[PDB]
Design a binder for this molecule. Structure first.
Ligand SMILES: [Mg+2]
Ligand SMILES: [Mg+2]
Ligand SMILES: [Mg+2]
Ligand SMILES: [Mg+2]
Lengths: 852, 58
RNA sequence: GAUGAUUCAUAAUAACUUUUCGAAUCGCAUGGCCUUGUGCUGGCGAUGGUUCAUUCAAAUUUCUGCCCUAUCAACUUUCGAUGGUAGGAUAGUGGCCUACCAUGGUUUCAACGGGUAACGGAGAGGGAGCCUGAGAAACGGCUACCACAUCCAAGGAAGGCAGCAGGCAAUUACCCAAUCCUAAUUCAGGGAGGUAGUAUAAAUAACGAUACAGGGCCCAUUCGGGUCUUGUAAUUGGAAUGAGUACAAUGUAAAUACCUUAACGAGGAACAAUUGGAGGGCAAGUCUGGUGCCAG
RNA sequence: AUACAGUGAAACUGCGAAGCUCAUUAAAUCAGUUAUCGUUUAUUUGAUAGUUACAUGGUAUAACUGUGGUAA
């Protein structure tokens, strides 16, 4: 018997008393043997703890198997062999055999999202990713334990170097793994984190150095308990409110019940909450409340019915609280579609009068004419135009998660709310339901992953005024110092992430690991002019793709695992099959972020212009010591650029973004036919060739894309507005203007080609329409061919049209939209469009007669 | 069995009694004196190549 | 040639065949010759192989063989009942099965049916199908169907325990030695098999010496009568041995056990068997009814 | 032991794997007996085949080496 350090038990006991989580880091080969002991201490402190345990690993379990029969056979053979006594089981096997352990791969971390577990084990330290770390820790209840096993020799060596001297970084013989290095330092700050060896000796490096046992034993429960008795008589409110776990949750349910009571169909209720605060539980209870109240047609809409499983589960728990019985008062209908995995689609209720709860796909807004209540769960993941259509003359409940799953940027929610300013009711859920508010682990987790980052308005700019874009200068950011966890770097990393999260539409937690560890990636910042921590105005992230990356790829394949992928080099490869462009080294702008409030001041355009100059060379070792830190920001001159041929972008096609890139001399080369499910936007790739580099290949690519765009307008781009399609054509034609050469030129239609395209009778039919001796419907045949020739430029300078007319011809010929549909888009009377349409065709007839 | 020793862990009063190149690195870790938090205090960071070392945020 | 009997044995001719077989094997030994080449020629076994016979078996088959029965007189052709021809199948005979043909067969001498101290043939969760071998419709395996039930990361996987043995509670441990059996076999194995485990004859005592006392016993309602070595609630001596405490050998595959056998092992022989019955007697004692001192 | 030669895991070949529990049945079970000129028969026992070769092929793989999937 060895006396364990009093720090280890005091931490577990303190966490249980305060319902706060605790992190233990076990270093050593025998680390697994200590887990049974930590579990016993957790239970002995309080018997109300959840006994389930979560075990997360990458590929292999540490020296055992989770199949009961296989372990028993090995034990039986060993007993028969005489190696082991008949009834002897050392603690580790007893821990696995008896306890309820859920073994989960890192890849399938989405399975554990709903569940809650008493203790969490992360087997592999190296393979840790931000998503696997946020998903798992959120499933540990108050007073639970999170255990990380740093068993690898290299991980220990990293721990050794980092503790003795912070600035030094242990770097082995291209992935830098800065996130894991930055991760280790964050533990030292955590007050509830202990780092221990396999012999249960507390290594002093941990933050929980001075933990003392708290004296023996909250306001939130008092403000929650009292509310429950006061409503116990008032059915159905009393039974439903009893299910609430936190004061904020109960207020949300009461607010939902209030909206249900008003019976007015022009109100919207917006519920915003962090993940795990109980948004779905509140919504499911309210749906049960509306059922008992009397609502008949209740609708639920979400990106997929599978996500609604938690919501449906709490609806039944609300039904149970209301005394409804399955197969008597209500019936459950599951999906027959294999894709939805038997997800619940519709619940029909037969009490008092027939009431129906049903799942609808968001696109099917036409059926909402008779809807009394639609619950929009995870409205962040639905495209905004579709959400706009779903806002009909009926009661609406909207649930949006902030920084949960992929979710959406906080500003997009603000862009949603400002639109509502339809009467708007706003509700927010702040208190977590699995642990005490203000848990150090959660605050630790948010700081490490930068989830809770909020953009802050700078009063200093207001006093000094917005800097003119010419004054601003672009500065390179040194990644090593940025992820060194120095307080200045953390604040600067805090500010950079704010611009990141705010602007763009979806951001996964893995993006932080991608930025820190990937070698090809570089970071650029458009700081205000120097004259305090500098606060960025525009941040650009670049990814070097092309021939430069081949050396890294060859090394990765030598390791046995290809790393990452070259999107633009590959994308262009399949579309055009150009061998040269693969060998051409280039850079891809992964993401450009600007302050939304300083939008339209040209900071984004200024940053790109300086970026283009830097790689052109117009401005012409800081690695951390490998077993005092380098400057955080590097001027462009201080670092030599790589040799590049082009700059590439990849984004979902939108008018604002397309106009922004179009103004920066980018040329579209590809536009994906299948719209992205999350956004409904089509992925577009544009390229820009730098001066002093061959540009012929871009022009050929642009011309090929323009033809493909024209033919493909009918298939999947019919939804685009006529102006949008015209603009995309115009940007591609700008690539032709880039080439002063005349080697490639458009060809004027011959007499012979005209004869083959149109028979002599068709020309007579066209002429009659110009003379008004003929109807429109009969000439529907020639419009698409005329549009192809016009935007193919075969007519040449003889025929030209205005922007509005070009949109009209593009719509009928290529979009295949009806005339009346065009009238709405262009805000023109239908009679006027036909008159302009005739004017176009008379010009058409004059040219053909001139050709004849 | 709370009072008794189950597995290898025995609890009496408020103290628990448990039965139980890497070694050189481990014992080195066990003997470190300064905390990680304190070590940052002495370290100053340069924002720019020739700029002053900034220690703490204002 | 053989048998009682044969188209039986055996031989020959003409062909046939998804034409079979007629040592491309192994161990030990290195002899006899000469034409010296490692030239020729070789001894003892094993494992193989065609046919016949023998043996171990198996399958059909002839005839005989103790219940009451008519208040069981008709039964069989009831998807062959009785027989012939031909064919299918079997290892073969054969209604064993199929096509055609005849309308038969059992029985009052008991057919058929019923009852029975006729323990005086079946399957391995339930039916169906199939596979190996000389021998099986296999306590082996496989497929589908029908139920039971287990693990799981819920994508699948596997089972015959739906068993066995108990109660209304320890079936375990040691062996192939002894008798037998299987195998590439003297030697391997066998929960075949074997070994152990958990109403009856004895003892609790036998034999002496001394001292001190005069009463002891039997019958009889009655009164009384009859007879003599008796009593100790006394002291004392030396011998005998069993339960136990146990050294050995014998025993046995080993071991327990049995038999035999050194040393120790008794006076309260405290080395301390009981069960039942019939009578007493005692207090500065307690209670109850009275006609003192009594009665219960 | 300059083909190996003792012993020998694994694997391919060869041989052999053939007490219980329920039901019940009058010479259809069973005992004795006949025949197989009407049959199969591993094994044992005795007989029995004169009708490139100084040794052919992988048309061949296990055991074995090594790379992996899976909760198994
Ligand atoms: Mg016949
Ligand atoms: Mg005496
Ligand atoms: Mg006795
Ligand atoms: Mg023979």
């Amino acid at each position: 018997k060895k006396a364990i350090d009093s720090r280890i038990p005091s931490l577990i006991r303190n966490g249980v008393q305060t319902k706060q989580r605790s992190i233990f880091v076990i270093v050593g080969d025998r680390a697994r043997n200590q887990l049974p002991n930590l579990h016993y201490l957790m239970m002995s402190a309080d018997l109300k703890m959840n006994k389930s345990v979560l075990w997360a690993y990458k590929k292999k379990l540490l020296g055992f198997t989770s199949h009961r029969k296989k372990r028993e056979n090995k034990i039986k053979k060993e007993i028969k062999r005489g190696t082991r006594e008949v009834n002897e089981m050392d603690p580790f096997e007893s821990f696995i055999s008896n306890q309820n352990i859920r073994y989960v791969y890192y890849k399938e971390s989405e399975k554990i999202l709903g569940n809650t577990y008493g203790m969490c084990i992360l087997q592999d330290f190296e393979a840790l990713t931000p998503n696997l770390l946020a998903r798992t820790i959120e499933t540990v209840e108050g007073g639970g334990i999170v255990v990380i096993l740093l068993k690898s020799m290299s991980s220990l060596k990293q721990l050794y170097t980092m503790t003795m001297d912070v600035h030094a970084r242990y770097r082995t013989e291209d992935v830098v793994a800065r996130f894991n290095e930055r991760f280790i330092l964050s533990l030292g700050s955590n007050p509830n984190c202990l780092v221990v060896d396999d012999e249960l000796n507390v290594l002093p490096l941990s933050g929980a150095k001075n933990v003392k046992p708290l004296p023996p034993k909250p306001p939130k429960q008092l403000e929650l308990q009292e509310l429950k008795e006061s409503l116990e008589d008032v059915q159905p409110a009393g039974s439903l409110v009893s299910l609430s776990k936190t004061v904020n949750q109960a207020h949300a349910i009461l607010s939902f019940i209030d909206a249900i009571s008003e019976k007015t169909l022009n109100f919207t209720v917006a519920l915003t909450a962090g993940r795990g605060r109980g948004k779905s539980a509140a919504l499911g209870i309210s749906i049960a409340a509306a059922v008992s109240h009397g609502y008949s047609n209740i609708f639920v809409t979400s990106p997929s019915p599978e996500n609604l499983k938690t919501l449906f589960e709490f609806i039944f728990k609300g039904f149970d609280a209301l005394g409804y019985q399955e197969h008597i008062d209500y019936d459950i209908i599951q999906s027959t579609n294999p894709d939805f995995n038997k997800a619940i689609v519709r619940v029909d209720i037969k009490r008092d009068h027939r009431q129906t709860i049903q799942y609808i796909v968001p696109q099917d807004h036409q059926v909402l004419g008779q809807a009394e209540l639609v619950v929009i769960d995870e409205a962040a993941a639905i495209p905004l135009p579709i959400v706009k259509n779903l806002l009909g003359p009926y009661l609406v409940f909207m649930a949006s998660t902030i920084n949960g799953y992929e979710g959406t940027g906080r500003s997009l929610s603000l862009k949603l709310i400002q639109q509502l300013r339809r009467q708007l009711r706003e509700i927010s859920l702040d208190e977590p339901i699995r642990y005490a508010p203000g848990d150090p682990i959660e605050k630790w987790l948010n700081k490490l992953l930068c989830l809770d980052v909020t953009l802050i308005k700078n009063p200093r700019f207001a006093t000094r005024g917005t800097p003119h874009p010419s004054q601003c200068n672009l500065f390179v950011v040194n990644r090593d110092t940025l992820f060194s966890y120095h307080p200045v770097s953390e604040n600067f990393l805090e500010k950079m992430m704010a611009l990141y999260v705010s602007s763009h539409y979806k951001n996964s937690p893995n993006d932080l690991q991608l930025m820190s560890d990937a070698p090809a990636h570089k970071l650029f910042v458009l700081l205000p002019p120097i004259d305090r921590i500098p606060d960025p105005l525009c941040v650009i992230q670049i990814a070097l793709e092309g021939e430069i990356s081949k050396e890294s790829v060859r090394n990765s394949l030598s390791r046995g695992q290809r790393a990452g992928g070259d999107l633009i080099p590959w994308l262009i490869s399949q579309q055009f099959q150009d061998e040269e462009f693969a060998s051409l080294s280039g850079a891809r702008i992964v993401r450009i972020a600007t302050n939304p409030e300083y939008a339209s001041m040209g900071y984004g355009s200024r940053a790109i212009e300086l970026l283009r100059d830097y790689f052109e060379g117009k401005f012409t070792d800081y690695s951390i010591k490998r077993v005092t830190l380098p400057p955080l920001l590097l001027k462009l001159s201080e670092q030599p650029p790589h040799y590049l041929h082009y700059l590439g972008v990849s984004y979902g096609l939108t008018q604002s973004l397309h106009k922004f890139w179009k103004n920066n001399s980018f040329v579209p080369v590809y536009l994906r036919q299948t719209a992205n499910d999350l956004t409904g936007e089509h992925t577009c790739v544009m390229l820009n060739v730098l001066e002093g580099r061959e540009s012929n290949w871009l022009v050929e690519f642009a011309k090929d894309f323009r033809k493909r765009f024209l033919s493909l307008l009918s298939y999947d781009f019919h939804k685009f507005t006529a102006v949008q399609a015209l603009s995309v054509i115009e940007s591609s034609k700008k690539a032709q203007d880039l080439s002063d050469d005349e080697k490639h030129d458009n060809k004027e239609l011959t007499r012979t080609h005209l004869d083959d395209i149109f028979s002599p009778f068709d020309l007579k039919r066209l002429d009659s329409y110009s003379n008004n001796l003929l109807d429109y419907h009969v000439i529907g045949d020639m419009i698409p061919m005329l549009a192809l020739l016009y935007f193919g430029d075969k007519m040449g300078d003889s025929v030209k049209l205005s922007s509005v007319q070009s949109a009209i011809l593009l719509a009928i010929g290529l979009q295949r939209k009806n005339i009346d549909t065009i009238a709405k888009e262009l805000n023109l009377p239908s009679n006027q469009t036909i008159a302009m349409f005739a004017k176009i065709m008379r010009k058409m007839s004059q040219y053909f007669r001139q050709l004849l | 069995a709370p009072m008794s020793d189950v597995g290898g862990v025995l609890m009496d009063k408020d103290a628990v009694y448990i039965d139980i190149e890497g070694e050189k690195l481990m014992t080195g870790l066990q003997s470190v004196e300064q905390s990680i938090a304190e070590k940052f205090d002495g370290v100053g960071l340069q924002l720019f190549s020739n700029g002053t070392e900034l220690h703490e945020v204002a």
